[PDB]
Amino acid sequence: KESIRRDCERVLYFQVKNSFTKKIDQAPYQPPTYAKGTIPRVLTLSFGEGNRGDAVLGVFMDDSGDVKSQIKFDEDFQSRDFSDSLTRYIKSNNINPDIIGISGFNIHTKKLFDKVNELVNEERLTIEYDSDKHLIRVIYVNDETARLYQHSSKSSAEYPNRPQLAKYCIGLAKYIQSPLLEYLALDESMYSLHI
Amino acid sequence: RRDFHILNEAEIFQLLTRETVDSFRKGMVIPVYVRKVESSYMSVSTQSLIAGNIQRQDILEPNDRRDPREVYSVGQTVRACILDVDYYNFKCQLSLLRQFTENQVAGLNVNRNPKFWDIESENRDRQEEIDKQREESRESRVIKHPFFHNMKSKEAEDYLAARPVGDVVIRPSSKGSNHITISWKVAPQLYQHIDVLEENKDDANAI
Amino acid sequence: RFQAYRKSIKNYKLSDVDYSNERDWIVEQLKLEKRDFLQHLTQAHSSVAHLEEKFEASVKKIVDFIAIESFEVPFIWNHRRDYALHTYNDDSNNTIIVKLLNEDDLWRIVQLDLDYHSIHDKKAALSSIYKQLDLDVVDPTYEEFFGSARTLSELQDIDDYLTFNYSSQVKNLTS
Amino acid sequence: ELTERGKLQIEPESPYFDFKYAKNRPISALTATPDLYLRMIQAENDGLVNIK
Amino acid sequence: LKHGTYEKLDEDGLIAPGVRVSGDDIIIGKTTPIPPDTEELGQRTKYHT
Amino acid sequence: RKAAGLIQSIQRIGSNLVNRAHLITEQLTSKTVFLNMASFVYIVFDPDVERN
Amino acid sequence: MFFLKDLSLILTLHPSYFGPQMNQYLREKLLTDVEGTCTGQFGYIVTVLDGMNIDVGKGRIIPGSGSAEFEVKYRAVVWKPFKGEVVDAIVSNVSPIGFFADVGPLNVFVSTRLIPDNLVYNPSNSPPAYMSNDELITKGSKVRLKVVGTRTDVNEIYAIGSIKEDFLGAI
Amino acid sequence: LHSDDDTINSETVEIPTSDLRKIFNVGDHVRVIHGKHTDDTGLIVEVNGDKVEFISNQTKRTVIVFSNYLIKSTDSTVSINESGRFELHDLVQVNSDLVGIVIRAQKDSFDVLCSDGKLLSLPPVSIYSKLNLNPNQQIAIDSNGVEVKVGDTVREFTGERRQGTILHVYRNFLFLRSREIVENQGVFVTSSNRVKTI
Amino acid sequence: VSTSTVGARRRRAKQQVDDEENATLLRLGPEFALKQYDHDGNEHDLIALSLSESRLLIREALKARSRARNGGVIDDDELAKVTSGAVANGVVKKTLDYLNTFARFKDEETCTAVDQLLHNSSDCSVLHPFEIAQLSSLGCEDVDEAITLIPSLAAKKEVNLQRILDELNRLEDP
RNA sequence: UCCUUUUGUGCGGCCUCGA
């Protein structure tokens, strides 16, 4: 019984190790016409729980890892005003995203994803390297590390004047920019993940 | 490193709902919160906010002919069985029929091979569990009457032995609380037990 | 990480004979654990003779690196990969590379290296107990099932045998 | 085999229901599915079942 | 807010003459400002001030 | 623990590591530890800065 | 250590049970509420002597609620450990921080700082054990330990033992 | 003062606090006054003069704190209010596909009972989120088909035939609170199909 | 839950050193004092019980309850299952296992002889009942061993400890 | 897709009502 227990524990150990290896083995997102491993410029959006009251918060991170121009939208995301505000925000000369990431707490995030994707496709919002032109990509972001990041005291000390949802957006953008370092930043909390 | 992983339909569904595509699939039975009731369709919302739908052929029983509005009401919660899942649009179809909601109990593919599963012990244990679910509670009956005495048949005969012919005693019947046996002395060491059936009883102890 | 692994080891520096026994024990353990892989290797590469001998030599070289040179698994995997694979030219002059070991096997070799020292301590204690027994003539059963013993369960069985059959000497040294 | 605790508490919901009445399972095949045997051991530690 | 009704008030917060009033109904609408809570976490038009 | 000691040593010498060999010549690390870690830590080389 | 004590319990009965079987129902309720319980003041109550012939007296009707309150006095066997007492035990689990033993229903935890150093914990052993040259203590092995401290909970008791003194350890 | 002479033991002496050092005996309940391990209680194990070692009650592990930071408090009575982000008996999302209910709460850790019955001990930061389910979602249906809401008492019919009052609802699982199950402070997990309403 | 027959004990100002529980100092507290009172208020002595006496009493009470519940019509498992309460069943099972694996005297007559020897003896007329229970329970073999395990017996040197221990070993079934 | 709601001051002074 002891021998079979030890053997099965070894096999399960190697299976868990392989699963975790599959989890953390991810390169940063490669923008088109750029060499693999280049850090992209990221814009992340999330209204939170998707309720009536909840507003959409955006965070833009450049390729150097510096958070720039956090903004708050003060209108219903299903209206034309939100679309106009997002179009003005993206087309601003000081912001040039390579990818747009979206994540949330429930199925209402699908409406935001579809709205942003339809707006990007219709307005033809292309990547601004400031030739061939490519539209910005809109994806769902796995928020395994963002939900623990937003409550961490390190994040709170880093950004004292920001709410939790802003920290969630920063966590999503950091995860897009470097998944490995975001997993490392969890420290003892990474053993509680679903491996 | 490998390229950045992009979520597929199943991963997006698991991300947004926290229900895997294994624990939410065809044939499962879940409780759903009814939201709309119409003549031909019914719209419900599950626990994880996935919008369900049930059609006229799946609301009412084949022998039923009443209108769907009379049968269910908004705000009520019922059990339903999944008939289809659309993992991309977060929509599902359900059925409230008895054949789907209740009969499908063995939802797990347990390998019940006779050489690999103890079938007979399982059957004996399940039979004993049904024989324990058949257990019931029971208690004596109390009646207030001058000629009523809580005695057995032989006890009533012995009580009537000391009394002359024609005296009457009343005792509870063995056929149930709805029956009363009346014993009267026909002759010395000869007694007749007559069972009386009670109708329109106000209570078990009542007359 | 090696210091953390070897912090519990009372004495890590083995003698030459004990080190050779350790290498043989790790080779046998890997042969037991990787039976299906060795069967696949033998079946699918029948044209090459004595591949299992090359596997034994590779495992011994990896054990040599880990124990004597104290190389960790990433360094061996990156800069010592030629000792973990075998190459040959077929009849059609086809260059064929066969991967005998992977990174998980290197980690398993590290684990077996850590595991064997408990067996070595138990065997040393059992041999010391036998020395204090001081038999006039060597017991053939003891040496027979002590030379071939490779798990601590069999060492415990030999310990039980010795404390039973020679209980009087144990009592004298000291139920 | 099931103890009384195992005879009662082993419900379909429980993860131990997979091996409630298992038999004739060879040792050689246990290493292919380590989770099954680990769940058997953990059920044994709870005092529900006995591995024979 | 109170449990009474507010639909009888006008734009200026005052009821008009000729309107029927029952108990508890609101006849004068007045508000005082309050330093807003952490609702600047995002409440587009529904943060109390 | 070795990483923190290495970081503190680099910050003592000037927070800049010119060459891989300086992990040995400046006594920052021992022989076997450097032999393990030499090819897994790198120093970004700018040709415009180093014309020689 | 086991003792005989005269204990009392207050039992409240709902008026729906005011029948001829009131005494026996009170007896079974008392048995279910006393047998196996653990009170920090007394220790562990294992059995109640003469459990079918306990006097219950006359219940007092609580004003304003109708329910009757009964004062039931009984004699029961009670076990309670004491500080500085040496008792036998059986090891139930082995861990690097120490070993857990069972003294009847009570579970006693002994840390390594109260264990002699020669009894080195061997995790490679099958089963894992705290072993010395002449001593080997594992799961199911008889051990004699001395209770040093007792921790009282709401309905539980936690005891801490030690084996560092003489005439202790393996037996 | 305490001494071998009886006549000395019956005398009271007033002594300045500047020349007094506390005496800590092995096996005494002591509560930490101040430090990183503040409000931790347990039993003294080793007294190394100035430094005292004791097995904790909350973390149940040995902690080394200086003797100046200890007060002999025979009972813990620790209140966990104004800490963490989780009230007692909160239904907390552990990770992506794991959930549980807080059974006991501590200053820097929590005890969580999973839906399958396994108990976990985690730091507050490692918990994924807290499930604030709506009241309509917090409704289940018993084996008979009768609706059962939070606060409705139900009693099983399968298995051990236990009884409890509904504390939380997650999918088909009902978290019940009971008086007689002292093992987990009354909290035991059963599916709604196993219970009948009273 | 259950309340002792000893009550009152109201607030005062003096503090005593004979308040902490300690087996070595023979300070068993007020609820386990040498003098007790029954339901009638009469004088009563503290009743200690060795594992043999406790095992006999629990077996007798359990079999009496089992016979009574069965209409007056030996296995430890069935006898434990007679009782009600799953936690109670586990507790009585653990006590039955502990008593069985450390039963020094499994016979009624041997236990009676042990109790008579430990009670009617002139030396034991001063011995505390807790000391008697500890001696009959732990099964010590030496005077020095008994003194080390039981510090209270060190101050009572007027007891023929060695011959009593040898008689206990003789009565103990090998 | 939308619907969604909750509570009250304190302290004095004066004038009255029924005995």
Side-chain angles (χ1 to χ4, degrees):
Chain A
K1 201 184 295 189
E2 184 69 25
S3 177
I4 306 160
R5 185 185 70 75
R6 276 188 259 108
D7 284 318
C8 291
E9 270 189 15
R10 184 197 73 241
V11 177
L12 181 61
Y13 169 97
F14 278 114
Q15 282 184 356
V16 169
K17 184 176 173 292
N18 281 275
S19 299
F20 195 87
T21 294
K22 271 198 171 293
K23 291 175 83 81
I24 54 167
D25 188 7
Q26 290 181 74
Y29 171 81
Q30 179 190 352
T33 68
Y34 276 72
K36 188 171 167 177
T38 305
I39 304 299
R41 298 161 294 176
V42 191
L43 172 60
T44 56
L45 297 169
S46 194
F47 42 43
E49 280 277 341
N51 294 319
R52 200 209 292 108
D54 296 358
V56 179
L57 297 187
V59 167
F60 179 71
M61 284 192 92
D62 69 323
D63 52 6
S64 82
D66 289 330
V67 174
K68 293 179 179 179
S69 190
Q70 315 185 28
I71 199 168
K72 170 174 169 271
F73 298 96
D74 306 307
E75 50 267 17
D76 187 6
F77 93 101
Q78 288 187 123
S79 74
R80 176 58 41 174
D81 294 331
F82 176 86
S83 309
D84 299 347
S85 291
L86 187 53
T87 298
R88 288 164 45 213
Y89 186 69
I90 292 169
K91 290 214 303 198
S92 176
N93 61 6
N94 54 11
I95 286 171
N96 308 302
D98 285 306
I99 186 170
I100 292 161
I102 296 174
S103 190
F105 300 158
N106 53 49
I107 69 163
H108 291 293
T109 316
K110 171 167 166 48
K111 298 188 176 186
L112 178 57
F113 177 85
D114 290 5
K115 188 68 172 176
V116 173
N117 205 32
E118 171 205 340
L119 182 65
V120 160
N121 279 275
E122 272 295 354
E123 294 294 329
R124 200 174 182 270
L125 305 177
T126 57
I127 298 173
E128 312 200 303
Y129 315 113
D130 193 7
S131 194
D132 295 338
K133 292 185 177 182
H134 320 280
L135 277 72
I136 304 169
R137 279 295 305 280
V138 187
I139 58 158
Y140 288 97
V141 191
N142 177 34
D143 61 342
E144 274 189 316
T145 72
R147 309 272 272 256
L148 304 186
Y149 178 82
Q150 60 172 352
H151 309 305
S152 77
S153 54
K154 174 60 169 74
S155 67
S156 308
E158 207 177 357
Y159 313 101
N161 308 320
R162 307 305 316 206
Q164 300 197 45
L165 192 64
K167 303 170 187 173
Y168 178 70
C169 294
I170 291 164
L172 292 174
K174 278 194 175 193
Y175 184 89
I176 289 169
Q177 287 196 330
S178 182
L180 167 66
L181 285 175
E182 269 296 295
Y183 275 107
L184 292 185
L186 294 180
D187 194 350
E188 293 295 350
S189 301
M190 71 184 148
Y191 311 127
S192 300
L193 302 171
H194 171 258
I195 301 161
Chain B
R1 283 179 285 184
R2 272 201 275 285
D3 303 355
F4 191 77
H5 182 46
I6 289 177
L7 282 63
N8 51 28
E9 288 189 355
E11 282 168 302
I12 285 160
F13 185 85
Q14 177 167 9
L15 175 74
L16 296 184
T17 62
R18 291 153 202 93
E19 279 160 334
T20 75
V21 308
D22 299 350
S23 71
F24 190 90
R25 52 181 173 68
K26 168 73 153 58
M28 272 200 60
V29 170
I30 48 167
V32 298
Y33 167 79
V34 178
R35 284 192 170 200
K36 291 180 179 179
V37 189
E38 296 276 301
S39 305
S40 63
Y41 76 91
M42 183 180 292
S43 306
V44 306
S45 181
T46 70
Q47 289 159 306
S48 48
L49 302 170
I50 298 161
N53 180 276
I54 303 99
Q55 299 297 308
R56 175 54 173 72
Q57 55 267 26
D58 285 303
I59 297 171
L60 307 169
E61 286 292 299
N63 56 16
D64 207 334
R65 282 86 175 92
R66 294 185 324 282
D67 183 279
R69 276 75 59 79
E70 199 274 326
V71 183
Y72 294 99
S73 298
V74 183
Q76 186 177 359
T77 183
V78 293
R79 262 207 311 251
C81 181
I82 309 180
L83 264 287
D84 193 20
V85 182
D86 190 350
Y87 294 105
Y88 185 95
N89 293 293
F90 298 81
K91 293 174 185 177
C92 64
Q93 289 211 357
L94 313 168
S95 186
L96 274 70
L97 307 178
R98 307 296 102 72
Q99 58 187 14
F100 301 140
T101 53
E102 296 189 333
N103 302 75
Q104 301 201 175
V105 173
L108 301 173
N109 300 330
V110 178
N111 186 18
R112 294 150 168 281
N113 186 303
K115 295 296 185 69
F116 285 62
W117 191 266
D118 202 5
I119 296 287
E120 282 68 24
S121 300
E122 187 180 11
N123 273 277
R124 185 177 65 246
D125 281 355
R126 177 173 50 69
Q127 178 268 354
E128 187 254 26
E129 175 61 33
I130 306 176
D131 211 41
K132 291 285 284 179
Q133 290 165 100
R134 294 173 198 131
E135 191 179 65
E136 296 177 318
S137 69
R138 294 173 176 264
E139 258 306 328
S140 65
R141 187 182 174 185
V142 176
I143 305 179
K144 181 55 181 176
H145 185 266
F147 290 97
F148 176 80
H149 289 109
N150 275 318
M151 317 192 88
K152 293 180 185 183
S153 55
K154 187 184 176 188
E155 285 181 321
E157 293 188 25
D158 295 339
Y159 185 81
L160 293 174
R163 290 172 167 281
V165 177
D167 283 327
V168 181
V169 76
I170 304 168
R171 63 182 183 90
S173 185
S174 56
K175 299 185 186 178
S177 62
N178 300 19
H179 286 260
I180 284 172
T181 295
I182 300 181
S183 310
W184 83 284
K185 183 180 193 163
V186 179
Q189 300 187 345
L190 190 65
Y191 318 90
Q192 174 184 45
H193 310 286
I194 303 156
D195 180 39
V196 184
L197 170 61
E198 294 165 87
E199 287 183 335
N200 314 135
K201 292 169 65 73
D202 308 328
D203 194 13
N205 294 310
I207 300 155
Chain C
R1 271 174 287 279
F2 278 3
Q3 288 192 68
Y5 293 145
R6 299 169 189 185
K7 194 179 178 185
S8 61
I9 306 304
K10 302 179 182 178
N11 187 19
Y12 194 87
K13 185 59 174 66
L14 302 182
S15 80
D16 297 350
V17 181
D18 304 302
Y19 187 59
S20 186
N21 291 338
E22 176 179 32
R23 293 167 67 187
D24 299 340
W25 186 84
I26 295 172
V27 165
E28 290 169 5
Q29 274 286 348
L30 267 195
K31 274 193 177 188
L32 284 178
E33 293 184 2
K34 298 202 78 185
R35 181 42 47 183
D36 58 356
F37 162 78
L38 290 177
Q39 189 78 321
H40 181 274
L41 214 65
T42 304
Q43 292 311 126
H45 308 83
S46 58
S47 56
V48 181
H50 294 46
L51 265 168
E52 61 275 31
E53 277 83 353
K54 309 310 178 188
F55 184 84
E56 293 178 23
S58 290
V59 171
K60 291 191 168 189
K61 288 172 184 176
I62 298 289
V63 170
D64 287 337
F65 290 146
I66 281 158
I68 289 167
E69 308 198 49
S70 69
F71 296 148
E72 195 166 25
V73 170
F75 180 84
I76 295 170
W77 184 241
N78 286 273
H79 306 292
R80 296 287 190 269
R81 200 174 295 177
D82 286 321
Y83 299 93
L85 53 81
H86 175 67
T87 70
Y88 65 98
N89 290 316
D90 208 357
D91 51 6
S92 304
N93 202 50
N94 295 332
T95 313
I96 305 298
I97 295 93
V98 185
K99 306 177 188 292
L100 304 172
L101 294 161
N102 53 40
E103 209 156 21
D104 288 344
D105 292 322
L106 270 45
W107 287 112
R108 185 59 188 154
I109 287 166
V110 170
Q111 292 171 4
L112 292 169
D113 187 2
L114 295 172
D115 283 0
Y116 178 80
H117 283 283
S118 65
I119 309 302
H120 180 255
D121 298 336
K122 190 74 181 78
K123 191 145 62 175
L126 178 65
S127 177
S128 179
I129 289 294
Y130 181 73
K131 291 293 108 178
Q132 285 110 27
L133 292 177
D134 194 14
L135 275 299
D136 302 350
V137 178
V138 184
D139 196 339
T141 68
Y142 163 78
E143 64 180 1
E144 182 187 351
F145 290 94
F146 177 85
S148 68
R150 78 178 309 277
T151 72
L152 72 165
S153 179
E154 292 150 48
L155 300 173
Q156 184 63 48
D157 294 346
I158 298 287
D159 196 326
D160 293 1
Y161 163 85
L162 282 177
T163 188
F164 173 79
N165 290 109
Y166 307 112
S167 65
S168 54
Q169 280 77 0
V170 171
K171 186 185 188 182
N172 287 350
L173 291 167
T174 302
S175 181
Chain D
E1 61 169 15
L2 305 173
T3 64
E4 309 312 314
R5 290 264 317 273
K7 194 184 289 287
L8 296 180
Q9 299 185 246
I10 302 311
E11 297 283 77
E13 64 180 3
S14 190
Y16 308 146
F17 188 84
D18 186 353
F19 52 82
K20 187 182 183 171
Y21 294 111
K23 74 170 190 175
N24 293 331
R25 275 163 169 72
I27 284 173
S28 64
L30 290 171
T31 59
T33 60
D35 59 353
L36 175 60
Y37 193 71
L38 259 291
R39 218 152 64 249
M40 283 188 201
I41 289 173
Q42 198 208 342
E44 183 185 6
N45 287 338
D46 290 349
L48 306 176
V49 306
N50 311 316
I51 288 92
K52 297 293 188 175
Chain E
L1 287 200
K2 293 184 175 71
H3 43 93
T5 185
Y6 282 82
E7 296 332 286
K8 290 162 170 169
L9 296 178
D10 280 3
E11 272 134 16
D12 61 341
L14 304 173
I15 199 154
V19 175
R20 222 282 234 180
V21 278
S22 313
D24 290 326
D25 284 3
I26 303 293
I27 53 163
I28 293 161
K30 200 176 61 166
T31 58
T32 197
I34 278 293
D37 204 357
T38 68
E39 292 171 338
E40 297 173 48
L41 181 144
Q43 306 282 275
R44 44 175 158 110
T45 59
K46 315 202 75 163
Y47 66 102
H48 313 280
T49 88
Chain F
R1 292 163 190 81
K2 287 193 141 84
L6 175 59
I7 281 171
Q8 289 170 5
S9 306
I10 296 290
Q11 290 178 354
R12 290 180 183 173
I13 64 171
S15 309
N16 196 161
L17 181 77
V18 182
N19 195 321
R20 266 171 179 166
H22 288 187
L23 293 170
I24 286 294
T25 68
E26 308 308 287
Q27 316 304 317
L28 305 173
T29 60
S30 63
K31 191 180 73 69
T32 71
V33 176
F34 168 78
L35 191 61
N36 280 264
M37 72 167 292
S39 59
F40 301 114
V41 299
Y42 64 96
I43 307 167
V44 177
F45 185 82
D46 190 358
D48 295 328
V49 180
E50 283 288 333
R51 325 290 291 129
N52 189 11
Chain G
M1 178 46 64
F2 298 92
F3 292 94
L4 280 191
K5 278 286 287 190
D6 299 348
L7 305 188
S8 76
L9 191 54
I10 283 286
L11 274 181
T12 294
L13 187 64
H14 192 269
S16 49
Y17 299 106
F18 286 170
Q21 316 92 338
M22 180 165 56
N23 289 321
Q24 72 181 11
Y25 177 81
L26 274 174
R27 289 174 217 274
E28 286 114 19
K29 188 195 273 275
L30 161 74
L31 287 180
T32 54
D33 295 10
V34 166
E35 296 282 327
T37 198
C38 165
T39 67
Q41 209 276 348
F42 291 113
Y44 287 75
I45 297 98
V46 286
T47 45
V48 170
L49 313 181
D50 198 23
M52 309 315 293
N53 301 318
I54 308 163
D55 190 13
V56 299
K58 300 189 193 189
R60 184 178 62 85
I61 299 300
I62 302 299
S65 69
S67 294
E69 182 180 2
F70 285 81
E71 165 82 22
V72 191
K73 292 179 215 158
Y74 64 101
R75 308 173 42 81
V77 183
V78 58
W79 188 86
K80 182 169 92 171
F82 307 132
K83 167 153 57 182
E85 189 40 62
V86 185
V87 290
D88 293 331
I90 289 172
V91 170
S92 56
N93 185 23
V94 190
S95 64
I97 60 165
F99 69 101
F100 302 87
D102 297 336
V103 187
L106 168 62
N107 180 255
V108 187
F109 163 60
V110 183
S111 168
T112 51
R113 309 176 179 200
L114 300 180
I115 300 171
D117 302 330
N118 47 320
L119 280 166
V120 184
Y121 167 55
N122 190 0
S124 296
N125 200 335
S126 289
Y130 281 68
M131 63 190 305
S132 82
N133 304 344
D134 309 317
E135 315 182 359
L136 163 76
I137 288 173
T138 186
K139 181 163 187 176
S141 309
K142 301 184 185 175
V143 293
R144 174 166 293 167
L145 55 91
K146 175 183 184 185
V147 170
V148 179
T150 63
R151 173 171 56 199
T152 292
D153 205 325
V154 183
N155 279 338
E156 280 197 340
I157 297 166
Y158 297 89
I160 287 179
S162 177
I163 47 170
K164 192 177 290 295
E165 306 160 16
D166 301 331
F167 310 97
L168 304 183
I171 45 171
Chain H
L1 295 163
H2 270 59
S3 47
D4 303 333
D5 302 329
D6 288 347
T7 63
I8 303 177
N9 300 334
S10 74
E11 324 186 337
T12 58
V13 186
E14 316 166 0
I15 305 190
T17 75
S18 62
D19 285 335
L20 297 165
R21 204 183 94 267
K22 289 192 183 180
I23 294 180
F24 295 114
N25 198 9
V26 180
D28 300 339
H29 279 89
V30 286
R31 172 145 43 80
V32 175
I33 320 164
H34 181 270
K36 193 179 180 189
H37 304 287
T38 303
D39 293 342
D40 194 359
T41 74
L43 288 177
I44 296 169
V45 177
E46 210 171 325
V47 182
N48 288 121
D50 184 77
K51 304 156 190 168
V52 177
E53 314 176 355
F54 76 103
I55 284 168
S56 173
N57 282 359
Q58 283 177 13
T59 62
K60 317 190 177 184
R61 299 147 197 166
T62 72
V63 186
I64 307 168
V65 179
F66 299 101
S67 52
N68 313 337
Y69 296 158
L70 300 179
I71 273 169
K72 179 196 170 184
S73 164
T74 59
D75 194 357
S76 303
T77 60
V78 180
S79 287
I80 324 295
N81 206 32
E82 198 53 47
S83 75
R85 316 193 318 280
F86 311 115
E87 188 57 273
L88 176 61
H89 298 156
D90 272 347
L91 188 71
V92 291
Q93 181 89 18
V94 175
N95 62 50
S96 176
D97 60 355
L98 201 65
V99 74
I101 180 161
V102 174
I103 302 303
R104 212 191 165 289
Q106 297 183 334
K107 186 62 176 178
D108 300 288
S109 64
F110 283 93
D111 304 338
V112 171
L113 175 63
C114 186
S115 60
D116 61 13
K118 278 74 176 176
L119 189 76
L120 301 176
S121 190
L122 297 163
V125 292
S126 66
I127 288 164
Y128 192 75
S129 66
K130 160 65 176 84
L131 288 183
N132 299 325
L133 302 179
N134 292 319
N136 52 20
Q137 287 165 20
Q138 214 71 3
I139 306 289
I141 173 156
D142 73 351
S143 62
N144 304 295
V146 179
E147 296 148 88
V148 285
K149 316 158 100 166
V150 295
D152 289 344
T153 52
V154 301
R155 172 175 56 74
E156 304 189 61
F157 61 102
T158 70
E160 301 202 317
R161 312 206 299 177
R162 295 176 297 188
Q163 171 186 338
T165 179
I166 293 172
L167 199 63
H168 269 90
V169 179
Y170 178 73
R171 294 218 197 92
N172 289 306
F173 305 99
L174 306 183
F175 294 91
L176 289 156
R177 173 162 197 74
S178 182
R179 317 312 316 181
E180 69 274 14
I181 294 97
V182 187
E183 296 181 19
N184 290 319
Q185 294 146 30
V187 183
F188 70 88
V189 192
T190 51
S191 61
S192 73
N193 299 317
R194 289 170 53 165
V195 309
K196 285 189 176 184
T197 185
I198 300 179
Chain I
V1 188
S2 191
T3 316
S4 80
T5 181
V6 174
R9 189 70 272 171
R10 277 177 193 186
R11 179 65 181 270
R12 282 180 189 170
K14 268 193 176 185
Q15 309 307 314
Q16 64 276 6
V17 76
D18 301 350
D19 182 273
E20 294 86 341
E21 200 74 21
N22 200 322
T24 73
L25 311 179
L26 288 185
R27 306 173 189 188
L28 296 174
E31 70 274 24
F32 278 102
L34 188 62
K35 313 303 293 186
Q36 310 280 262
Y37 294 128
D38 53 356
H39 305 134
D40 316 322
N42 301 122
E43 203 195 38
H44 183 59
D45 288 327
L46 168 64
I47 303 304
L49 285 180
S50 65
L51 274 70
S52 79
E53 297 164 345
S54 315
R55 207 175 170 280
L56 287 195
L57 262 180
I58 187 170
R59 272 193 59 89
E60 176 72 20
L62 277 182
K63 72 179 53 181
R65 186 183 312 174
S66 186
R67 179 171 54 249
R69 83 163 180 78
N70 278 320
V73 292
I74 45 168
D75 188 30
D76 294 337
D77 285 336
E78 160 196 345
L79 199 55
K81 285 184 292 184
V82 167
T83 62
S84 182
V87 56
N89 287 313
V91 164
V92 302
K93 274 183 176 182
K94 290 190 185 69
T95 58
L96 275 186
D97 299 327
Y98 186 91
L99 287 181
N100 192 2
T101 59
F102 294 94
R104 199 170 180 206
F105 313 101
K106 299 189 179 176
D107 305 335
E108 182 179 354
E109 302 187 1
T110 65
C111 193
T112 311
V114 163
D115 186 24
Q116 288 176 17
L117 163 66
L118 293 172
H119 280 204
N120 310 122
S121 294
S122 65
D123 295 1
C124 301
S125 57
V126 190
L127 282 186
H128 206 267
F130 181 79
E131 305 168 322
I132 299 159
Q134 280 302 326
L135 284 169
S136 177
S137 303
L138 288 188
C140 315
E141 309 171 355
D142 302 329
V143 166
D144 293 329
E145 170 185 30
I147 287 170
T148 301
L149 296 182
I150 313 169
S152 68
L153 300 181
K156 301 198 179 188
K157 299 187 177 182
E158 308 163 349
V159 178
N160 287 127
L161 185 50
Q162 185 60 58
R163 61 176 291 276
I164 285 161
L165 285 167
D166 303 348
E167 290 185 39
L168 276 173
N169 300 341
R170 157 199 159 178
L171 287 160
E172 184 167 25
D173 291 323

